[PDB]
Design an enzyme around this catalytic site. Structure first.
Site, PDB file in Angstrom:
ATOM      1  N   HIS A  41       0.807  -1.213   0.000  1.00 17.32           N
ATOM      2  CA  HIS A  41       0.000   0.000   0.000  1.00 17.32           C
ATOM      3  C   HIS A  41       0.855   1.285   0.000  1.00 17.32           C
ATOM      4  O   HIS A  41       0.296   2.381  -0.104  1.00 17.32           O
ATOM      5  CB  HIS A  41      -1.033   0.039   1.137  1.00 17.32           C
ATOM      6  CG  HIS A  41      -0.482   0.059   2.545  1.00 17.32           C
ATOM      7  ND1 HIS A  41       0.190   1.135   3.094  1.00 17.32           N
ATOM      8  CD2 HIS A  41      -0.599  -0.847   3.544  1.00 17.32           C
ATOM      9  CE1 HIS A  41       0.496   0.874   4.359  1.00 17.32           C
ATOM     10  NE2 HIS A  41       0.037  -0.330   4.650  1.00 17.32           N
ATOM     11  N   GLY A 143       2.745   5.673  10.469  1.00 17.35           N
ATOM     12  CA  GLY A 143       4.087   5.526   9.940  1.00 17.35           C
ATOM     13  C   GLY A 143       4.773   4.235  10.338  1.00 17.35           C
ATOM     14  O   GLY A 143       5.922   4.002   9.935  1.00 17.35           O
ATOM     15  N   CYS A 145       3.880   1.199   9.548  1.00 16.57           N
ATOM     16  CA  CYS A 145       3.686   0.098   8.622  1.00 16.57           C
ATOM     17  C   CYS A 145       5.031  -0.373   8.093  1.00 16.57           C
ATOM     18  O   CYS A 145       5.946   0.436   7.883  1.00 16.57           O
ATOM     19  CB  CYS A 145       2.845   0.518   7.452  1.00 16.57           C
ATOM     20  SG  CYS A 145       1.193   1.068   7.983  1.00 16.57           S
TER      21      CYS A 145
HETATM   22  C1  LIG Z   1      -7.261   5.858   5.341  1.00 14.06           C
HETATM   23  C2  LIG Z   1      -6.772   6.656   6.551  1.00 14.06           C
HETATM   24  C3  LIG Z   1      -7.881   6.728   7.602  1.00 14.06           C
HETATM   25  C4  LIG Z   1      -6.452   8.077   6.088  1.00 14.06           C
HETATM   26  C5  LIG Z   1      -5.504   6.039   7.137  1.00 14.06           C
HETATM   27  C6  LIG Z   1      -5.406   5.679   8.472  1.00 14.06           C
HETATM   28  C7  LIG Z   1      -4.238   5.161   9.000  1.00 14.06           C
HETATM   29  C8  LIG Z   1      -3.105   4.984   8.191  1.00 14.06           C
HETATM   30  N1  LIG Z   1      -1.873   4.461   8.708  1.00 14.06           N
HETATM   31  C9  LIG Z   1      -0.757   5.242   8.772  1.00 14.06           C
HETATM   32  O1  LIG Z   1       0.321   4.775   9.076  1.00 14.06           O
HETATM   33  C10 LIG Z   1      -0.852   6.673   8.480  1.00 14.06           C
HETATM   34  C11 LIG Z   1       0.130   7.496   8.012  1.00 14.06           C
HETATM   35  N2  LIG Z   1      -0.423   8.741   7.916  1.00 14.06           N
HETATM   36  C12 LIG Z   1      -1.687   8.653   8.338  1.00 14.06           C
HETATM   37  N3  LIG Z   1      -1.999   7.429   8.693  1.00 14.06           N
HETATM   38  C13 LIG Z   1      -1.808   3.066   9.160  1.00 14.06           C
HETATM   39  C14 LIG Z   1      -2.962   2.194   8.620  1.00 14.06           C
HETATM   40  O2  LIG Z   1      -3.889   1.825   9.338  1.00 14.06           O
HETATM   41  N4  LIG Z   1      -2.753   1.727   7.386  1.00 14.06           N
HETATM   42  C15 LIG Z   1      -3.659   1.848   6.248  1.00 14.06           C
HETATM   43  C16 LIG Z   1      -3.187   0.950   5.124  1.00 14.06           C
HETATM   44  C17 LIG Z   1      -4.291   0.041   4.593  1.00 14.06           C
HETATM   45  C18 LIG Z   1      -5.522   0.827   4.217  1.00 14.06           C
HETATM   46  C19 LIG Z   1      -6.015   1.668   5.373  1.00 14.06           C
HETATM   47  C20 LIG Z   1      -5.105   1.575   6.600  1.00 14.06           C
HETATM   48  C21 LIG Z   1      -1.615   2.896  10.662  1.00 14.06           C
HETATM   49  C22 LIG Z   1      -1.901   3.849  11.621  1.00 14.06           C
HETATM   50  C23 LIG Z   1      -1.676   3.592  12.947  1.00 14.06           C
HETATM   51  C24 LIG Z   1      -1.138   2.418  13.285  1.00 14.06           C
HETATM   52  N5  LIG Z   1      -0.873   1.470  12.420  1.00 14.06           N
HETATM   53  C25 LIG Z   1      -1.094   1.723  11.128  1.00 14.06           C
HETATM   54  C26 LIG Z   1      -3.208   5.351   6.845  1.00 14.06           C
HETATM   55  C27 LIG Z   1      -4.388   5.854   6.341  1.00 14.06           C
END
Ligand SMILES: CC(C)(C)c1ccc(N(C(=O)c2c[nH]cn2)[C@H](C(=O)NC2CCCCC2)c2cccnc2)cc1
Ligand SMILES: CC(C)(C)c1ccc(N(C(=O)c2c[nH]cn2)[C@H](C(=O)NC2CCCCC2)c2cccnc2)cc1
Ligand SMILES: [Cl-]
Ligand code: NA
Lengths: 306, 305
Positions: A41, A143, A145
């Site tokens: 992703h 961040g 991931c």
């Molecule tokens: C779609 C939305 C709501 C905007 C979102 C939310 C979280 C993130 N995640 C950020 O790491 C991250 C970086 N900047 C903002 N969020 C992580 C996350 O869930 N993975 C996404 C990848 C798969 C699709 C959706 C989830 C995350 C966060 C906290 C702890 N573990 C992982 C990414 C996008």
């Protein structure tokens, strides 16, 4: 003596952590030999998150669209491919710090250490378990991931988990290092939720054996139980069924302590009925389920404090 | 989201662990620059341990009586001396993996990571606190002496603990890296015991803030208190006194959550007087006291090393 949530030393994994950037998205990758592994992703943009077509997104990328940074050094990407939900970036340098390693897919109840990383740099290490509902109860921020889970029995690093996402209850989902999710989850923003979780019975029993090894007997009783009767009770407390496989793997601990497995099951039944009455077991007022039978034998003495 | 008992990444310390053998005794040493540090009781026989004269035992040892092994390489010892309860073995090679480091002595209530080692080989890492009674609740088996405790700041490792002994209740005692014991303990087989311990109040408050940050709010209430009133309750429950410096240190967490320290103290007062009524906080049924305010801010903000 003593009993702690104990992780594996993280140095062999620290030497493999890198930063991967595609577009405006940065996360962590794992650099082994001349391959960097990371969540696919990383190639998604803000409008692509509900229903990304990853094959179509990836065909539009060149090797030089991927920026890989190992500390201060930029690595040159010379190829890329997708395996399930993991991206594999071939680079022009083999990691000189690559440990002896393998990839293993684990089952619910198994434990592992997590090295939480941000921007390719390690933050901390802790112990986790794969829950029966195929989530992990991690500690992960935006961040994180691409952070990985691992064990290091016998100087070889077994990588078992790569972090992909956080679910609405605050628990975490991810893949093995072949990119296959644990559980029914998908790398899409569509609504997903963990199932009802349950307690890992075989691990609770292992931990009660650890308490006996370390000198505690107050929770034992004069009773035994059949396996089926134990399971009928335990499921009323949202405990997982105990199988004959679990009974068999508790054999060594049973032999070291002199307490038959179904006798310990009768102790667990009484603790669920009664609570601890103001006492603790190995420093906890709850029944702990994230130590496996293998973990207890790795950490505890081979001589019972009688 | 989430909150775990989290240790520092241990790689910078792993590259410093060696095996030290003297006579029949093998334990662990810390190799920094061209010196290996280990417990001085490595030189004792079983009889010596009952009433040891450490200066006398050491003068009869030659450099070749100390066998130092870094992985599968023998290091050559070219000198030996003692500093308090630590032995310093000068070797002919500086450790190429020496990190930026300092030696620091910590205060009760402060936390650190322990790298448990056997035969010079790192085996596990976990987080500990220096208890008010100057013990640590570690996990250590025979052969673990010389395992070390540390914190990290950016790239500098601060070593604060070297393991020397287990006490009868199964808790642990050791020294700083200058060989000064934490607590009223001695490196000799004599009657010794952990004293009555207390709970680290400022750390419990920090962990309640961690809980609020992670969505656990059931214990919050409308009430506040004063430092004097709360400390009379603390004494009653064998909690350490809360000082104004502790209140100041929690300031950032109070501003972030909207719960003033004395407001949270009224929550803690009620938990001590009434219990949890069957509920949990961050997955615990006890009040956890081995996270400092700094630990909470660091884990909830993602600091890296
Ligand atoms: C779609 C939305 C709501 C905007 C979102 C939310 C979280 C993130 N995640 C950020 O790491 C991250 C970086 N900047 C903002 N969020 C992580 C996350 O869930 N993975 C996404 C990848 C798969 C699709 C959706 C989830 C995350 C966060 C906290 C702890 N573990 C992982 C990414 C996008
Ligand atoms: C014989 C006697 C006094 C009961 C004993 C007990 C323990 C050891 N210790 C072994 O490491 C060890 C190795 N082989 C056998 N014992 C450790 C220990 O307490 N240090 C001694 C040094 C100072 C004088 C007495 C204590 C130890 C064990 C477990 C965890 N932490 C440290 C040594 C001797
Ligand atoms: Cl009030
Ligand atoms: Na309040």
């Amino acid at each position: 003596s003593g009993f702690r949530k104990m992780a594996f030393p993280s140095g062999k994994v620290e030497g493999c952590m890198v930063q991967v950037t595609c577009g405006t998205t940065t996360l962590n990758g794992l650099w082994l030999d001349d391959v960097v592994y990371c969540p696919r992703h990383v190639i998604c943009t803000s409008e692509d998150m509900l229903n990304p077509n990853y094959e179509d997104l990836l065909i539009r990328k060149s090797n030089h669209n991927f920026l890989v940074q190992a500390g201060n050094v930029q690595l040159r990407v010379i190829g890329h491919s997708m395996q399930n939900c993991v991206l594999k970036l071939k680079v022009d340098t083999a990691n000189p710090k690559t440990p002896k390693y393998k990839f293993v897919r684990i089952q619910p109840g198994q434990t592992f250490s997590v090295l939480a990383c941000y921007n390719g740099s390690p933050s901390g290490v802790y112990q986790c378990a794969m829950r029966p509902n195929f989530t992990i109860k991690g500690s992960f921020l935006n961040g994180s991931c691409g952070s990985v889970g691992f064990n290091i029995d016998y100087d070889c690093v077994s990588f078992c988990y790569m972090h992909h996402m956080e679910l609405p209850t605050g628990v975490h989902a991810g893949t093995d290092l072949e990119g296959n999710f644990y559980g029914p989850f998908v790398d899409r923003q569509t609504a997903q939720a963990a199932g009802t979780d349950t307690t890992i019975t075989v691990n609770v029993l292992a931990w009660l054996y650890a308490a006996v090894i370390n000198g505690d007997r107050w929770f034992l009783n004069r009773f035994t139980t059949t396996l089926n009767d134990f399971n009928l009770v335990a499921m009323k407390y949202n405990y997982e069924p105990l199988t004959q496989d679990h009974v068999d793997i508790l054999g060594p601990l049973s032999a070291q302590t002199g307490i038959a497995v179904l006798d310990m099951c009768a102790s667990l039944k009484e603790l669920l009925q009664n609570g601890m009455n103001g006492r603790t077991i190995l420093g906890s007022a709850l029944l702990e389920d994230e130590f496996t039978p293998f973990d207890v034998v790795r950490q505890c003495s081979g001589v019972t404090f009688q």
